[PDB]
mmCIF file with all atom_site columns, C-alpha atoms in Angstrom:
data_model
loop_
_atom_site.group_PDB
_atom_site.id
_atom_site.type_symbol
_atom_site.label_atom_id
_atom_site.label_alt_id
_atom_site.label_comp_id
_atom_site.label_asym_id
_atom_site.label_entity_id
_atom_site.label_seq_id
_atom_site.pdbx_PDB_ins_code
_atom_site.Cartn_x
_atom_site.Cartn_y
_atom_site.Cartn_z
_atom_site.occupancy
_atom_site.B_iso_or_equiv
_atom_site.pdbx_formal_charge
_atom_site.auth_seq_id
_atom_site.auth_comp_id
_atom_site.auth_asym_id
_atom_site.auth_atom_id
_atom_site.pdbx_PDB_model_num
ATOM 1   C CA . UNK A 1 1   ? 126.293 43.463  28.579  1.00 0.00 ? 1   UNK A CA 1
ATOM 2   C CA . UNK A 1 2   ? 126.045 40.763  25.899  1.00 0.00 ? 2   UNK A CA 1
ATOM 3   C CA . UNK A 1 3   ? 125.173 42.121  22.436  1.00 0.00 ? 3   UNK A CA 1
ATOM 4   C CA . UNK A 1 4   ? 121.460 42.142  21.669  1.00 0.00 ? 4   UNK A CA 1
ATOM 5   C CA . UNK A 1 5   ? 120.218 39.149  19.688  1.00 0.00 ? 5   UNK A CA 1
ATOM 6   C CA . UNK A 1 6   ? 116.898 39.573  17.916  1.00 0.00 ? 6   UNK A CA 1
ATOM 7   C CA . UNK A 1 7   ? 114.498 36.719  17.241  1.00 0.00 ? 7   UNK A CA 1
ATOM 8   C CA . UNK A 1 8   ? 113.458 36.655  13.599  1.00 0.00 ? 8   UNK A CA 1
ATOM 9   C CA . UNK A 1 9   ? 109.892 37.786  13.098  1.00 0.00 ? 9   UNK A CA 1
ATOM 10  C CA . UNK A 1 10  ? 108.083 34.906  11.456  1.00 0.00 ? 10  UNK A CA 1
ATOM 11  C CA . UNK A 1 11  ? 104.646 34.181  10.101  1.00 0.00 ? 11  UNK A CA 1
ATOM 12  C CA . UNK A 1 12  ? 104.545 31.726  13.030  1.00 0.00 ? 12  UNK A CA 1
ATOM 13  C CA . UNK A 1 13  ? 105.608 34.103  15.826  1.00 0.00 ? 13  UNK A CA 1
ATOM 14  C CA . UNK A 1 14  ? 103.402 36.920  14.519  1.00 0.00 ? 14  UNK A CA 1
ATOM 15  C CA . UNK A 1 15  ? 100.521 34.450  14.245  1.00 0.00 ? 15  UNK A CA 1
ATOM 16  C CA . UNK A 1 16  ? 100.864 33.601  17.949  1.00 0.00 ? 16  UNK A CA 1
ATOM 17  C CA . UNK A 1 17  ? 100.899 37.138  19.337  1.00 0.00 ? 17  UNK A CA 1
ATOM 18  C CA . UNK A 1 18  ? 97.975  37.417  21.694  1.00 0.00 ? 18  UNK A CA 1
ATOM 19  C CA . UNK A 1 19  ? 97.148  40.915  20.414  1.00 0.00 ? 19  UNK A CA 1
ATOM 20  C CA . UNK A 1 20  ? 96.838  39.448  16.920  1.00 0.00 ? 20  UNK A CA 1
ATOM 21  C CA . UNK A 1 21  ? 94.875  36.441  18.142  1.00 0.00 ? 21  UNK A CA 1
ATOM 22  C CA . UNK A 1 22  ? 92.368  38.868  19.645  1.00 0.00 ? 22  UNK A CA 1
ATOM 23  C CA . UNK A 1 23  ? 91.733  39.884  16.038  1.00 0.00 ? 23  UNK A CA 1
ATOM 24  C CA . UNK A 1 24  ? 90.843  36.312  15.115  1.00 0.00 ? 24  UNK A CA 1
ATOM 25  C CA . UNK A 1 25  ? 88.576  35.915  18.121  1.00 0.00 ? 25  UNK A CA 1
ATOM 26  C CA . UNK A 1 26  ? 86.625  39.060  17.236  1.00 0.00 ? 26  UNK A CA 1
ATOM 27  C CA . UNK A 1 27  ? 86.288  37.752  13.668  1.00 0.00 ? 27  UNK A CA 1
ATOM 28  C CA . UNK A 1 28  ? 84.896  34.342  14.641  1.00 0.00 ? 28  UNK A CA 1
ATOM 29  C CA . UNK A 1 29  ? 82.244  35.859  16.920  1.00 0.00 ? 29  UNK A CA 1
ATOM 30  C CA . UNK A 1 30  ? 81.306  38.149  14.024  1.00 0.00 ? 30  UNK A CA 1
ATOM 31  C CA . UNK A 1 31  ? 80.724  34.947  12.026  1.00 0.00 ? 31  UNK A CA 1
ATOM 32  C CA . UNK A 1 32  ? 79.003  33.189  14.910  1.00 0.00 ? 32  UNK A CA 1
ATOM 33  C CA . UNK A 1 33  ? 76.752  36.253  15.081  1.00 0.00 ? 33  UNK A CA 1
ATOM 34  C CA . UNK A 1 34  ? 76.263  35.934  11.312  1.00 0.00 ? 34  UNK A CA 1
ATOM 35  C CA . UNK A 1 35  ? 75.346  32.266  11.685  1.00 0.00 ? 35  UNK A CA 1
ATOM 36  C CA . UNK A 1 36  ? 72.983  33.487  14.401  1.00 0.00 ? 36  UNK A CA 1
ATOM 37  C CA . UNK A 1 37  ? 71.274  35.788  11.898  1.00 0.00 ? 37  UNK A CA 1
ATOM 38  C CA . UNK A 1 38  ? 70.965  32.989  9.393   1.00 0.00 ? 38  UNK A CA 1
ATOM 39  C CA . UNK A 1 39  ? 69.739  30.215  11.685  1.00 0.00 ? 39  UNK A CA 1
ATOM 40  C CA . UNK A 1 40  ? 66.998  32.526  13.019  1.00 0.00 ? 40  UNK A CA 1
ATOM 41  C CA . UNK A 1 41  ? 65.882  33.369  9.507   1.00 0.00 ? 41  UNK A CA 1
ATOM 42  C CA . UNK A 1 42  ? 66.405  29.865  8.039   1.00 0.00 ? 42  UNK A CA 1
ATOM 43  C CA . UNK A 1 43  ? 64.247  28.387  10.809  1.00 0.00 ? 43  UNK A CA 1
ATOM 44  C CA . UNK A 1 44  ? 61.627  31.160  10.782  1.00 0.00 ? 44  UNK A CA 1
ATOM 45  C CA . UNK A 1 45  ? 61.273  31.066  6.988   1.00 0.00 ? 45  UNK A CA 1
ATOM 46  C CA . UNK A 1 46  ? 60.598  27.340  7.110   1.00 0.00 ? 46  UNK A CA 1
ATOM 47  C CA . UNK A 1 47  ? 58.117  28.128  9.899   1.00 0.00 ? 47  UNK A CA 1
ATOM 48  C CA . UNK A 1 48  ? 56.108  30.434  7.623   1.00 0.00 ? 48  UNK A CA 1
ATOM 49  C CA . UNK A 1 49  ? 56.535  27.932  4.776   1.00 0.00 ? 49  UNK A CA 1
ATOM 50  C CA . UNK A 1 50  ? 55.159  25.117  6.912   1.00 0.00 ? 50  UNK A CA 1
ATOM 51  C CA . UNK A 1 51  ? 52.531  27.224  8.662   1.00 0.00 ? 51  UNK A CA 1
ATOM 52  C CA . UNK A 1 52  ? 50.958  28.439  5.435   1.00 0.00 ? 52  UNK A CA 1
ATOM 53  C CA . UNK A 1 53  ? 50.837  25.044  3.713   1.00 0.00 ? 53  UNK A CA 1
ATOM 54  C CA . UNK A 1 54  ? 49.728  23.046  6.759   1.00 0.00 ? 54  UNK A CA 1
ATOM 55  C CA . UNK A 1 55  ? 46.726  25.312  7.157   1.00 0.00 ? 55  UNK A CA 1
ATOM 56  C CA . UNK A 1 56  ? 46.426  25.638  3.371   1.00 0.00 ? 56  UNK A CA 1
ATOM 57  C CA . UNK A 1 57  ? 45.798  21.895  3.128   1.00 0.00 ? 57  UNK A CA 1
ATOM 58  C CA . UNK A 1 58  ? 43.247  22.169  5.959   1.00 0.00 ? 58  UNK A CA 1
ATOM 59  C CA . UNK A 1 59  ? 41.286  24.799  4.035   1.00 0.00 ? 59  UNK A CA 1
ATOM 60  C CA . UNK A 1 60  ? 41.027  22.506  1.024   1.00 0.00 ? 60  UNK A CA 1
ATOM 61  C CA . UNK A 1 61  ? 40.272  19.503  3.238   1.00 0.00 ? 61  UNK A CA 1
ATOM 62  C CA . UNK A 1 62  ? 37.355  21.447  4.748   1.00 0.00 ? 62  UNK A CA 1
ATOM 63  C CA . UNK A 1 63  ? 35.722  21.882  1.346   1.00 0.00 ? 63  UNK A CA 1
ATOM 64  C CA . UNK A 1 64  ? 36.761  18.503  -0.037  1.00 0.00 ? 64  UNK A CA 1
ATOM 65  C CA . UNK A 1 65  ? 35.061  16.470  2.695   1.00 0.00 ? 65  UNK A CA 1
ATOM 66  C CA . UNK A 1 66  ? 32.153  18.940  2.553   1.00 0.00 ? 66  UNK A CA 1
ATOM 67  C CA . UNK A 1 67  ? 31.679  18.047  -1.108  1.00 0.00 ? 67  UNK A CA 1
ATOM 68  C CA . UNK A 1 68  ? 31.351  14.374  -0.142  1.00 0.00 ? 68  UNK A CA 1
ATOM 69  C CA . UNK A 1 69  ? 28.783  15.493  2.433   1.00 0.00 ? 69  UNK A CA 1
ATOM 70  C CA . UNK A 1 70  ? 26.758  17.075  -0.368  1.00 0.00 ? 70  UNK A CA 1
ATOM 71  C CA . UNK A 1 71  ? 26.632  13.860  -2.399  1.00 0.00 ? 71  UNK A CA 1
ATOM 72  C CA . UNK A 1 72  ? 25.326  11.712  0.452   1.00 0.00 ? 72  UNK A CA 1
ATOM 73  C CA . UNK A 1 73  ? 22.959  14.584  1.278   1.00 0.00 ? 73  UNK A CA 1
ATOM 74  C CA . UNK A 1 74  ? 21.804  14.583  -2.345  1.00 0.00 ? 74  UNK A CA 1
ATOM 75  C CA . UNK A 1 75  ? 21.865  10.856  -3.189  1.00 0.00 ? 75  UNK A CA 1
ATOM 76  C CA . UNK A 1 76  ? 20.070  10.125  0.107   1.00 0.00 ? 76  UNK A CA 1
ATOM 77  C CA . UNK A 1 77  ? 17.455  12.646  -1.006  1.00 0.00 ? 77  UNK A CA 1
ATOM 78  C CA . UNK A 1 78  ? 17.543  11.210  -4.553  1.00 0.00 ? 78  UNK A CA 1
ATOM 79  C CA . UNK A 1 79  ? 17.006  7.678   -3.230  1.00 0.00 ? 79  UNK A CA 1
ATOM 80  C CA . UNK A 1 80  ? 13.936  8.402   -1.120  1.00 0.00 ? 80  UNK A CA 1
ATOM 81  C CA . UNK A 1 81  ? 12.580  10.439  -4.037  1.00 0.00 ? 81  UNK A CA 1
ATOM 82  C CA . UNK A 1 82  ? 12.729  7.101   -5.882  1.00 0.00 ? 82  UNK A CA 1
ATOM 83  C CA . UNK A 1 83  ? 11.018  5.344   -2.935  1.00 0.00 ? 83  UNK A CA 1
ATOM 84  C CA . UNK A 1 84  ? 8.248   7.956   -2.865  1.00 0.00 ? 84  UNK A CA 1
ATOM 85  C CA . UNK A 1 85  ? 7.717   7.493   -6.582  1.00 0.00 ? 85  UNK A CA 1
ATOM 86  C CA . UNK A 1 86  ? 7.616   3.664   -6.426  1.00 0.00 ? 86  UNK A CA 1
ATOM 87  C CA . UNK A 1 87  ? 5.274   3.637   -3.444  1.00 0.00 ? 87  UNK A CA 1
ATOM 88  C CA . UNK A 1 88  ? 2.596   5.657   -5.225  1.00 0.00 ? 88  UNK A CA 1
ATOM 89  C CA . UNK A 1 89  ? 3.467   3.933   -8.509  1.00 0.00 ? 89  UNK A CA 1
ATOM 90  C CA . UNK A 1 90  ? 2.731   0.748   -6.547  1.00 0.00 ? 90  UNK A CA 1
ATOM 91  C CA . UNK A 1 91  ? -0.657  2.162   -5.567  1.00 0.00 ? 91  UNK A CA 1
ATOM 92  C CA . UNK A 1 92  ? -1.478  3.007   -9.202  1.00 0.00 ? 92  UNK A CA 1
ATOM 93  C CA . UNK A 1 93  ? -1.379  -0.762  -9.908  1.00 0.00 ? 93  UNK A CA 1
ATOM 94  C CA . UNK A 1 94  ? -3.383  -1.606  -6.775  1.00 0.00 ? 94  UNK A CA 1
ATOM 95  C CA . UNK A 1 95  ? -5.775  1.245   -7.468  1.00 0.00 ? 95  UNK A CA 1
ATOM 96  C CA . UNK A 1 96  ? -6.354  0.133   -11.030 1.00 0.00 ? 96  UNK A CA 1
ATOM 97  C CA . UNK A 1 97  ? -6.420  -3.610  -10.391 1.00 0.00 ? 97  UNK A CA 1
ATOM 98  C CA . UNK A 1 98  ? -9.302  -3.125  -7.934  1.00 0.00 ? 98  UNK A CA 1
ATOM 99  C CA . UNK A 1 99  ? -11.361 -1.519  -10.689 1.00 0.00 ? 99  UNK A CA 1
ATOM 100 C CA . UNK A 1 100 ? -10.454 -4.269  -13.161 1.00 0.00 ? 100 UNK A CA 1
ATOM 101 C CA . UNK A 1 101 ? -11.755 -6.838  -10.698 1.00 0.00 ? 101 UNK A CA 1
ATOM 102 C CA . UNK A 1 102 ? -14.854 -4.838  -9.740  1.00 0.00 ? 102 UNK A CA 1
ATOM 103 C CA . UNK A 1 103 ? -15.692 -4.205  -13.386 1.00 0.00 ? 103 UNK A CA 1
ATOM 104 C CA . UNK A 1 104 ? -14.819 -7.764  -14.460 1.00 0.00 ? 104 UNK A CA 1
ATOM 105 C CA . UNK A 1 105 ? -17.039 -8.970  -11.616 1.00 0.00 ? 105 UNK A CA 1
ATOM 106 C CA . UNK A 1 106 ? -19.755 -6.502  -12.656 1.00 0.00 ? 106 UNK A CA 1
ATOM 107 C CA . UNK A 1 107 ? -19.507 -7.578  -16.303 1.00 0.00 ? 107 UNK A CA 1
ATOM 108 C CA . UNK A 1 108 ? -19.778 -11.304 -15.547 1.00 0.00 ? 108 UNK A CA 1
ATOM 109 C CA . UNK A 1 109 ? -22.817 -10.626 -13.424 1.00 0.00 ? 109 UNK A CA 1
ATOM 110 C CA . UNK A 1 110 ? -24.389 -8.519  -16.186 1.00 0.00 ? 110 UNK A CA 1
ATOM 111 C CA . UNK A 1 111 ? -23.529 -11.237 -18.721 1.00 0.00 ? 111 UNK A CA 1
ATOM 112 C CA . UNK A 1 112 ? -25.301 -13.770 -16.546 1.00 0.00 ? 112 UNK A CA 1
ATOM 113 C CA . UNK A 1 113 ? -28.501 -11.830 -16.263 1.00 0.00 ? 113 UNK A CA 1
ATOM 114 C CA . UNK A 1 114 ? -28.621 -11.341 -20.028 1.00 0.00 ? 114 UNK A CA 1
ATOM 115 C CA . UNK A 1 115 ? -28.107 -15.003 -20.933 1.00 0.00 ? 115 UNK A CA 1
ATOM 116 C CA . UNK A 1 116 ? -30.503 -16.068 -18.148 1.00 0.00 ? 116 UNK A CA 1
ATOM 117 C CA . UNK A 1 117 ? -33.028 -13.668 -19.665 1.00 0.00 ? 117 UNK A CA 1
ATOM 118 C CA . UNK A 1 118 ? -32.168 -14.947 -23.149 1.00 0.00 ? 118 UNK A CA 1
ATOM 119 C CA . UNK A 1 119 ? -33.125 -18.465 -22.035 1.00 0.00 ? 119 UNK A CA 1
ATOM 120 C CA . UNK A 1 120 ? -36.403 -17.241 -20.508 1.00 0.00 ? 120 UNK A CA 1
ATOM 121 C CA . UNK A 1 121 ? -37.360 -15.546 -23.763 1.00 0.00 ? 121 UNK A CA 1
ATOM 122 C CA . UNK A 1 122 ? -36.294 -18.609 -25.731 1.00 0.00 ? 122 UNK A CA 1
ATOM 123 C CA . UNK A 1 123 ? -38.658 -20.688 -23.612 1.00 0.00 ? 123 UNK A CA 1
ATOM 124 C CA . UNK A 1 124 ? -41.538 -18.169 -23.673 1.00 0.00 ? 124 UNK A CA 1
ATOM 125 C CA . UNK A 1 125 ? -41.135 -17.804 -27.429 1.00 0.00 ? 125 UNK A CA 1
ATOM 126 C CA . UNK A 1 126 ? -41.147 -21.595 -27.813 1.00 0.00 ? 126 UNK A CA 1
ATOM 127 C CA . UNK A 1 127 ? -44.058 -22.105 -25.407 1.00 0.00 ? 127 UNK A CA 1
ATOM 128 C CA . UNK A 1 128 ? -46.273 -19.946 -27.630 1.00 0.00 ? 128 UNK A CA 1
ATOM 129 C CA . UNK A 1 129 ? -45.390 -21.886 -30.795 1.00 0.00 ? 129 UNK A CA 1
ATOM 130 C CA . UNK A 1 130 ? -46.506 -25.085 -29.080 1.00 0.00 ? 130 UNK A CA 1
ATOM 131 C CA . UNK A 1 131 ? -49.948 -23.610 -28.430 1.00 0.00 ? 131 UNK A CA 1
ATOM 132 C CA . UNK A 1 132 ? -50.389 -22.364 -31.994 1.00 0.00 ? 132 UNK A CA 1
ATOM 133 C CA . UNK A 1 133 ? -49.081 -25.705 -33.288 1.00 0.00 ? 133 UNK A CA 1
ATOM 134 C CA . UNK A 1 134 ? -51.477 -27.503 -30.953 1.00 0.00 ? 134 UNK A CA 1
ATOM 135 C CA . UNK A 1 135 ? -54.294 -25.175 -32.080 1.00 0.00 ? 135 UNK A CA 1
ATOM 136 C CA . UNK A 1 136 ? -53.619 -26.199 -35.674 1.00 0.00 ? 136 UNK A CA 1
ATOM 137 C CA . UNK A 1 137 ? -53.600 -29.924 -34.846 1.00 0.00 ? 137 UNK A CA 1
ATOM 138 C CA . UNK A 1 138 ? -56.850 -29.449 -32.939 1.00 0.00 ? 138 UNK A CA 1
ATOM 139 C CA . UNK A 1 139 ? -58.288 -27.522 -35.850 1.00 0.00 ? 139 UNK A CA 1
ATOM 140 C CA . UNK A 1 140 ? -57.156 -30.113 -38.398 1.00 0.00 ? 140 UNK A CA 1
ATOM 141 C CA . UNK A 1 141 ? -58.931 -32.911 -36.625 1.00 0.00 ? 141 UNK A CA 1
ATOM 142 C CA . UNK A 1 142 ? -62.081 -30.831 -36.402 1.00 0.00 ? 142 UNK A CA 1
ATOM 143 C CA . UNK A 1 143 ? -62.167 -30.780 -40.184 1.00 0.00 ? 143 UNK A CA 1
ATOM 144 C CA . UNK A 1 144 ? -60.974 -34.404 -40.267 1.00 0.00 ? 144 UNK A CA 1
ATOM 145 C CA . UNK A 1 145 ? -63.783 -35.496 -37.967 1.00 0.00 ? 145 UNK A CA 1
ATOM 146 C CA . UNK A 1 146 ? -66.315 -33.377 -39.899 1.00 0.00 ? 146 UNK A CA 1
ATOM 147 C CA . UNK A 1 147 ? -65.210 -34.501 -43.370 1.00 0.00 ? 147 UNK A CA 1
ATOM 148 C CA . UNK A 1 148 ? -65.308 -38.156 -42.302 1.00 0.00 ? 148 UNK A CA 1
ATOM 149 C CA . UNK A 1 149 ? -68.970 -37.956 -41.235 1.00 0.00 ? 149 UNK A CA 1
ATOM 150 C CA . UNK A 1 150 ? -69.934 -36.704 -44.685 1.00 0.00 ? 150 UNK A CA 1
ATOM 151 C CA . UNK A 1 151 ? -68.260 -39.804 -46.135 1.00 0.00 ? 151 UNK A CA 1
ATOM 152 C CA . UNK A 1 152 ? -69.436 -41.997 -43.267 1.00 0.00 ? 152 UNK A CA 1
ATOM 153 C CA . UNK A 1 153 ? -71.728 -44.984 -43.730 1.00 0.00 ? 153 UNK A CA 1
ATOM 154 C CA . UNK A 1 154 ? -74.514 -43.091 -41.995 1.00 0.00 ? 154 UNK A CA 1
ATOM 155 C CA . UNK A 1 155 ? -77.303 -43.308 -44.569 1.00 0.00 ? 155 UNK A CA 1
ATOM 156 C CA . UNK A 1 156 ? -79.403 -40.283 -43.490 1.00 0.00 ? 156 UNK A CA 1
ATOM 157 C CA . UNK A 1 157 ? -78.273 -36.816 -42.426 1.00 0.00 ? 157 UNK A CA 1
ATOM 158 C CA . UNK A 1 158 ? -80.633 -37.143 -39.441 1.00 0.00 ? 158 UNK A CA 1
ATOM 159 C CA . UNK A 1 159 ? -78.191 -39.697 -38.054 1.00 0.00 ? 159 UNK A CA 1
ATOM 160 C CA . UNK A 1 160 ? -75.131 -38.050 -39.706 1.00 0.00 ? 160 UNK A CA 1
ATOM 161 C CA . UNK A 1 161 ? -75.800 -34.729 -37.979 1.00 0.00 ? 161 UNK A CA 1
ATOM 162 C CA . UNK A 1 162 ? -76.427 -36.443 -34.628 1.00 0.00 ? 162 UNK A CA 1
ATOM 163 C CA . UNK A 1 163 ? -72.982 -38.093 -34.633 1.00 0.00 ? 163 UNK A CA 1
ATOM 164 C CA . UNK A 1 164 ? -70.845 -35.048 -35.392 1.00 0.00 ? 164 UNK A CA 1
ATOM 165 C CA . UNK A 1 165 ? -72.756 -33.343 -32.567 1.00 0.00 ? 165 UNK A CA 1
ATOM 166 C CA . UNK A 1 166 ? -71.694 -36.356 -30.489 1.00 0.00 ? 166 UNK A CA 1
ATOM 167 C CA . UNK A 1 167 ? -68.159 -36.327 -31.918 1.00 0.00 ? 167 UNK A CA 1
ATOM 168 C CA . UNK A 1 168 ? -67.557 -32.550 -31.912 1.00 0.00 ? 168 UNK A CA 1
ATOM 169 C CA . UNK A 1 169 ? -68.422 -32.137 -28.230 1.00 0.00 ? 169 UNK A CA 1
ATOM 170 C CA . UNK A 1 170 ? -66.423 -35.244 -27.319 1.00 0.00 ? 170 UNK A CA 1
ATOM 171 C CA . UNK A 1 171 ? -63.540 -33.624 -29.214 1.00 0.00 ? 171 UNK A CA 1
ATOM 172 C CA . UNK A 1 172 ? -64.148 -30.319 -27.421 1.00 0.00 ? 172 UNK A CA 1
ATOM 173 C CA . UNK A 1 173 ? -63.631 -32.246 -24.168 1.00 0.00 ? 173 UNK A CA 1
ATOM 174 C CA . UNK A 1 174 ? -60.412 -33.632 -25.636 1.00 0.00 ? 174 UNK A CA 1
ATOM 175 C CA . UNK A 1 175 ? -59.407 -30.178 -26.918 1.00 0.00 ? 175 UNK A CA 1
ATOM 176 C CA . UNK A 1 176 ? -59.862 -28.783 -23.434 1.00 0.00 ? 176 UNK A CA 1
ATOM 177 C CA . UNK A 1 177 ? -57.985 -31.569 -21.661 1.00 0.00 ? 177 UNK A CA 1
ATOM 178 C CA . UNK A 1 178 ? -55.164 -31.186 -24.199 1.00 0.00 ? 178 UNK A CA 1
ATOM 179 C CA . UNK A 1 179 ? -55.136 -27.468 -23.344 1.00 0.00 ? 179 UNK A CA 1
ATOM 180 C CA . UNK A 1 180 ? -55.021 -28.166 -19.600 1.00 0.00 ? 180 UNK A CA 1
ATOM 181 C CA . UNK A 1 181 ? -51.993 -30.422 -20.050 1.00 0.00 ? 181 UNK A CA 1
ATOM 182 C CA . UNK A 1 182 ? -49.989 -27.975 -22.176 1.00 0.00 ? 182 UNK A CA 1
ATOM 183 C CA . UNK A 1 183 ? -50.903 -25.235 -19.736 1.00 0.00 ? 183 UNK A CA 1
ATOM 184 C CA . UNK A 1 184 ? -49.321 -27.340 -17.027 1.00 0.00 ? 184 UNK A CA 1
ATOM 185 C CA . UNK A 1 185 ? -46.132 -28.664 -18.604 1.00 0.00 ? 185 UNK A CA 1
ATOM 186 C CA . UNK A 1 186 ? -45.361 -25.137 -19.844 1.00 0.00 ? 186 UNK A CA 1
ATOM 187 C CA . UNK A 1 187 ? -45.837 -23.850 -16.328 1.00 0.00 ? 187 UNK A CA 1
ATOM 188 C CA . UNK A 1 188 ? -43.659 -26.655 -14.982 1.00 0.00 ? 188 UNK A CA 1
ATOM 189 C CA . UNK A 1 189 ? -41.044 -26.012 -17.647 1.00 0.00 ? 189 UNK A CA 1
ATOM 190 C CA . UNK A 1 190 ? -40.977 -22.329 -16.825 1.00 0.00 ? 190 UNK A CA 1
ATOM 191 C CA . UNK A 1 191 ? -40.644 -22.769 -13.063 1.00 0.00 ? 191 UNK A CA 1
ATOM 192 C CA . UNK A 1 192 ? -37.807 -25.255 -13.475 1.00 0.00 ? 192 UNK A CA 1
ATOM 193 C CA . UNK A 1 193 ? -36.140 -22.745 -15.811 1.00 0.00 ? 193 UNK A CA 1
ATOM 194 C CA . UNK A 1 194 ? -36.447 -19.860 -13.343 1.00 0.00 ? 194 UNK A CA 1
ATOM 195 C CA . UNK A 1 195 ? -35.196 -22.094 -10.522 1.00 0.00 ? 195 UNK A CA 1
ATOM 196 C CA . UNK A 1 196 ? -32.022 -22.881 -12.438 1.00 0.00 ? 196 UNK A CA 1
ATOM 197 C CA . UNK A 1 197 ? -31.422 -19.170 -13.045 1.00 0.00 ? 197 UNK A CA 1
ATOM 198 C CA . UNK A 1 198 ? -32.054 -18.405 -9.373  1.00 0.00 ? 198 UNK A CA 1
ATOM 199 C CA . UNK A 1 199 ? -29.542 -20.984 -8.133  1.00 0.00 ? 199 UNK A CA 1
ATOM 200 C CA . UNK A 1 200 ? -26.942 -19.889 -10.711 1.00 0.00 ? 200 UNK A CA 1
ATOM 201 C CA . UNK A 1 201 ? -27.178 -16.369 -9.244  1.00 0.00 ? 201 UNK A CA 1
ATOM 202 C CA . UNK A 1 202 ? -26.863 -17.590 -5.657  1.00 0.00 ? 202 UNK A CA 1
ATOM 203 C CA . UNK A 1 203 ? -23.905 -19.819 -6.498  1.00 0.00 ? 203 UNK A CA 1
ATOM 204 C CA . UNK A 1 204 ? -22.239 -17.181 -8.672  1.00 0.00 ? 204 UNK A CA 1
ATOM 205 C CA . UNK A 1 205 ? -22.527 -14.616 -5.880  1.00 0.00 ? 205 UNK A CA 1
ATOM 206 C CA . UNK A 1 206 ? -21.056 -16.929 -3.208  1.00 0.00 ? 206 UNK A CA 1
ATOM 207 C CA . UNK A 1 207 ? -18.335 -17.941 -5.701  1.00 0.00 ? 207 UNK A CA 1
ATOM 208 C CA . UNK A 1 208 ? -17.165 -14.358 -6.280  1.00 0.00 ? 208 UNK A CA 1
ATOM 209 C CA . UNK A 1 209 ? -17.475 -13.151 -2.625  1.00 0.00 ? 209 UNK A CA 1
ATOM 210 C CA . UNK A 1 210 ? -14.872 -15.821 -1.810  1.00 0.00 ? 210 UNK A CA 1
ATOM 211 C CA . UNK A 1 211 ? -12.220 -14.177 -3.997  1.00 0.00 ? 211 UNK A CA 1
#
């Protein structure tokens, strides 16, 4: 029997024993299993992190867009409100203007009737002066005829008195014819006056009714 020879025990040879390698293998799995506790958590923690925020943003987005909805809902109300106000404000003008016109119309028509009447009275008032005036002239002659006879070449009152009686009555004829004429022109003047007023009314009425 050859003498025993013993391998040296080395870090290498010990390292390679399969019993000792079984220690390593156990250890790695223990670390795989640790990585398996971390990956689960790592992933799941990010899952909570993401889940909360992703819905957290949605909650805010729900209100945020809602707030926009409340401006359109308000402004759209606020704009019509303006339209309601202008529409009736627009009436206010139309309502008022109609009275302006009606009253302006009314006033013009009143103004007409007055002036028309003012002309009538101006004529009437004149017409009466003419007759007094005339009366005077007629009276003045009556003296003038009478005074002349007294200074006339008639020698005797018998003849003097006969001629004034002739003259006076002749003059009374003239006084009456004079009166007939002024009666007539005055009547003619008046009618023509009232006919102008009448037509003015007719034309004024047609002229307004147009507008």
